[PDB]
């Protein structure tokens, strides 16, 4: 990650340096004239081309879903496609990614995560493989101009295009795919192929349809760029250049490819075209096709939450919504907009009208503080996505003050408005942010600081380009005048850089958090009290004193976890009320980030998946939990399986296998450890160990065979008396097979008599077992294992298996 961040920053800086060289021979007035020279029919055609491209994207998704096999309604599929493609195109995995938004939509719609990951991989690979073939097709079409545009001889371009096409049609199509076609497809359109692992690649018809859709999409994009530009080359060379630029921009991982795409366009069509018309076309195309779609998708997502999850009185903890991660995007956009407006000189007439009413030193101070507030909002955008109440309040106040300072600065209807709208939108979604955590303790990945550095560099580039009329001198910094705008921009840029550097240093020199430690007796007693006050007997595994605890700081909650390698594997869902469960999950996620460790969960209940999703964990079913319902369990009603169970009960009662219950810490121990030794003739994090205090914590039930203790099992209970679960099981080998079933049914009967509504038989792994568990005809619920960002589950499962012993 640090290497990738450094490489991306270096590439962005090189791209900006190259861009400034290419637009060296243009003044801002020429660019403004070129922008104003674009006719209204050109703008209308640009909007129409963007709409057509978005219909084509809807197609992208429809084909991807048909490839995966997931069946979705047309409206839901269209909404998901538009949202994912608008969010992913504007920003690349910086705040929100296409995978994350499509997960948050489809998983809510009730679709497994593996299919969604398949869809995302298929769309990405389809675009990445369609780009080279279309580029080669355009080259084959018009190499006469392609040689001139790219500045290489036509022979080399022709031979490389032909070689690329031949390699694709041979290996990509037949030699490496039809030599090993495969036996059968799982969905309608697939061809699973041999290799190290089976691969899901579409059939010939689906591949042809996807290629046609991608060709139409890139044609629409090149078309909007083409028609927004007055003087144009032939469409084939322009399309080739556009495809190469898109590949270069998306290959650099820069969000939106802003640095390199413009650089390639300006380096390929500089001499043959007009620098001012080309720059105006590039800026207008980016604004129309990237910023406006992002704004529209953000508004649509917030409308969906404001209607489908606010009009109905859900009365639930508002998490996993799109409020936080999209409001963070809006706040980042507001921050970058303020930073950019700081560099550009104000409108002459507006500046004069303002300065004839407000003191000019106030204008300078407002400019500087507005730039600082822009940097602050840009940095606070990270806090909003983590759902911090303090971040919400601070960002709202800063946005309001920034709007006021933009009005006080050179009169700006635009910024002021945009900001007021963002502030109102943030205010309307207060309930999404709930954590009372402190901003100064917020972990910061290098990605966000890199984005901040990139935006600051962009602002300084805009400062250098826009204020090139005024010559540079050391007296500019000391200059203070109303008409002077270059000194203003210089001071604002210097202050923003100083503030950002100070904040980055302060957050980089922070002391490391304390390492994990084994809990002491007081924390064990606290955990026991919390478990007793809760209704999750599965949490009693914390009392073994083998897992670190993360107590919630309000009144009552905890979360067991253990660190293996670079992964902080956790136990079941945090114990406590639902209102504190999400907060504890967020705290655990923050803790893992500070330690640079990947968060991993284990055996997660189906109800809490929204929180695991919104902190950035991918669901993965791994087993089933049997749950015998004690509500009815009638002794008279019988069937094929129930008759043999009561026969077992009768045989055990006749044999003399009477079962006895004991209070906690009051059972014989030497016989119990003898039974355990016989059973094993250690392990943890799933069952526990044989410790006198650990077994003392819970009640112990022992079954006696002709008076001797032969088997026992640990009992988990709660004060709520809602659910009961079994901790660990041990039977002496000399006992008959009748013993285990009799113990099971005796515990079930006692728990039913005591009044407990439900009983738990444990969790059975997914994919020769489960035959014994299903004998008691229980209700079965899924159990999920969460992994971060859809990483490799093999490493996580191997680590859990290694830690289990």
């Amino acid at each position, epitope marked *: 990650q640090p290497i990738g961040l450094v490489f991306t920053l270096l590439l962005f800086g090189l791209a900006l340096v190259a861009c400034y060289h290419l637009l060296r021979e243009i003044d801002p007035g020429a660019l403004h004239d070129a922008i104003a020279d674009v006719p209204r029919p050109a703008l209308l055609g640009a909007l129409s081309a963007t709409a057509l491209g978005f219909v084509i994207l809807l197609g992208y998704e429809w084909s991807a879903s048909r490839f995966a096999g997931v069946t979705l309604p047309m409206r839901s599929l269209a909404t998901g496609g538009f949202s994912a493609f608008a969010i992913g195109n504007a920003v690349g995995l910086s705040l929100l990614s296409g995978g994350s938004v499509r997960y948050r939509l489809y998983s809510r719609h009730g679709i497994g995560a593996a299919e969604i990951a398949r869809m995302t991989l298929f769309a990405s690979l389809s675009l990445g493989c369609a780009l080279p073939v279309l580029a080669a097709l355009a080259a084959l079409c018009d190499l006469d101009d392609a040689a001139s545009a790219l500045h290489l001889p036509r022979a080399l371009v022709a031979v490389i295009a032909i070689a690329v096409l031949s390699l694709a049609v041979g290996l990509v199509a037949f030699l490496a795919r039809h030599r090993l076609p495969g036996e059968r497809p799982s969905p309608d359109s697939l061809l699973v192929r041999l290799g190290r692992r089976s691969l899901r690649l579409p059939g010939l018809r689906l591949s042809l349809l996807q290629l046609l859709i991608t060709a139409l999409d890139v044609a629409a994009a090149a078309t909007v760029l083409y028609l927004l530009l007055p003087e144009t080359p032939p469409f084939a060379a322009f399309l080739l250049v556009y495809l190469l630029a898109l590949a270069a921009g998306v290959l650099s991982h820069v969000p939106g490819g802003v640095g390199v795409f413009e650089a390639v366009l300006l380096a390929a069509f500089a001499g043959q075209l007009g620098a001012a018309p080309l720059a105006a076309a590039l800026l207008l195309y980016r604004l129309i096709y990237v910023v406006l779609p992002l704004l529209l998708a953000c508004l649509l997502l917030l409308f969906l939450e404001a209607r489908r999850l606010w009009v109905t009185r859900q009365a639930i903890r508002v998490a996993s919504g799109f409020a936080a991660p999209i409001l963070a995007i809006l706040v980042f956009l507001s921050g970058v907009v303020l930073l950019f407006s700081g560099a550009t000189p104000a409108i002459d007439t507006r500046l*004069e009208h303002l*300065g*004839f009413l*407000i*003191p*000019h*030193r*106030l204008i*300078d*101070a407002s400019h500087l503080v507005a730039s600082l507030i822009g940097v602050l909002c840009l940095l606070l955008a990270q806090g909003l996505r983590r759902r911090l109440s303090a971040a919400w309040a601070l960002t709202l106040v800063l946005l309001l003050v920034g709007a006021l300072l933009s009005l006080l600065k050179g009169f700006d209807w635009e910024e002021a408005s945009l900001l007021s709208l963002t502030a109102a939108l943030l205010a309307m979604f207060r309930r999404s942010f709930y954590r009372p955590s402190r901003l100064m303790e917020v972990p910061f990945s290098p990605l966000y600081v890199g984005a901040s550095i990139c935006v600051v560099g962009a602002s300084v580039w805009l400062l250098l380009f826009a204020n090139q009329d005024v010559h540079y001198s050391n007296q500019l910094w*000391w200059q*203070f*005048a*109303l*008409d002077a705008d270059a000194p203003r921009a210089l001071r604002a840029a210097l202050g923003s850089c100083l503030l950002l550097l100070a904040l980055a240093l302060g957050w980089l020199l922070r002391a490391a958090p304390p390492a994990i430690r084994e809990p002491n007796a007081e924390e064990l007693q606290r955990a026991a009290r919390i478990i007793r006050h809760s209704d999750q007997p599965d949490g009693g595994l914390a009392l073994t004193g083998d897992k670190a605890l993360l107590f919630h700081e309000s009144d009552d909650a905890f979360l067991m976890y253990a660190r293996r390698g670079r992964s902080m594997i956790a136990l079941y869902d945090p114990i406590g009320p639902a209102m504190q469960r999400a907060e504890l999950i967020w705290q655990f996620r923050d803790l893992c980030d500070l330690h640079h460790a990947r968060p991993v969960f284990y055996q997660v209940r189906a109800e809490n998946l929204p929180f695991y999703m919104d902190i950035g964990l991918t669901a993965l079913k791994l087993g089933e939990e049997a749950r015998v319902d004690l509500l009815r369990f009638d002794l008279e009603n019988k069937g094929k399986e129930m008759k043999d169970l009561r026969y077992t009960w009768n045989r055990g009662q006749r044999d003399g296998l009477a079962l006895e219950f004991h209070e906690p810490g009051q059972a014989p121990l030497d016989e119990l450890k003898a039974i355990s030794d016989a059973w094993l003739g250690e392990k943890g994090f799933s069952l526990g160990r044989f410790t006198p205090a650990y077994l003392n914590f819970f009640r112990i039930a022992i079954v006696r065979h002709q008076g001797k203790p032969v088997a026992f099992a640990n009992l988990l209970e709660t004060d709520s008396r809602e659910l009961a679960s079994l901790d660990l099981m041990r039977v002496h080998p000399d006992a008959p097979k009748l013993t285990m079933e009799f113990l099971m049914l005796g515990l079930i009967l006692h728990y039913k008599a005591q009044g407990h509504a439900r009983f738990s038989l444990g969790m059975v792994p997914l994919a020769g077992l489960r035959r014994f568990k299903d004998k008691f005809q229980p209700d079965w619920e899924p159990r999920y294992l969460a992994v971060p960002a859809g990483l490799d589950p093999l490493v996580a499962l191997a680590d859990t298996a290694a830690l289990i012993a």
Partner: nanobody
Amino acid sequence: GVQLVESGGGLVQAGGSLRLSCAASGFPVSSAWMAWYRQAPGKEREWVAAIFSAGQKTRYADSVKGRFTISRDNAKNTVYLQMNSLKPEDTAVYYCNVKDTGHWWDIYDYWGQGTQVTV
């Protein structure tokens, strides 16, 4: 500790001419943006003219683009604004406004007491 002192002494013009002086102490009146305004009786506030810097840039109002001709002494003295042909709407008080000085810490807008100018 900056003050502005006016002296115009105008009662009646009837299409004549008069001169106004705005004394200044705190600032050198050399690199200090400063101007004049108008407060008609019962009306809102309007401006008349301005001097930007070094006695070079001087923007006038809409109705007095060529009527008036203001100038600055260029030293640490008063600036001069003069009256001209009959403007019935000019029967108002005239303030002396200073919004910028050489100081970078000066945020306040200092005004003048104003002179009753009538035709």
